[PDB]
């Protein structure tokens, strides 16, 4: 199969960051799962499939809101800080 997942990470999110923002900025793909957490100041979406979930992290990726640098990235595994080598 692919290497990715549908899952998102958003970095850096400004003092009136509601629900609806994400809804609209994701309104032209299928929103499965929709989470908004200001106290972090991220946000967490779940799409359908893979596609959807490259594109918008593509765009919504090295973009800036408000003078400003907005950090994305596919979601991490099961959101587990771990310390250890890749591989060999």
């Known amino acids: ?49 893979g596609e959807q979930a490259e594109a918008a992290i593509n765009t919504f990726h090295q973009s800036r809101l408000r003078e400003r640098e907005l950090s994305v990235q596919l979601q991490p595994t099961d959101a587990l800080l771990c310390s250890g080598p890749s591989s060999g």
């Open 1 to 49: 199969g692919s290497s990715g997942s549908s899952g998102i990470l958003i970095r850096g999110l400004p003092g009136d960051v509601t629900n609806q923002e994400v809804h609209d900025l994701l309104s032209d793909y299928e929103l499965k799962y929709c989470f908004v957490d200001k106290y972090k100041g991220t946000a967490f979406v779940t799409l359908l499939n």
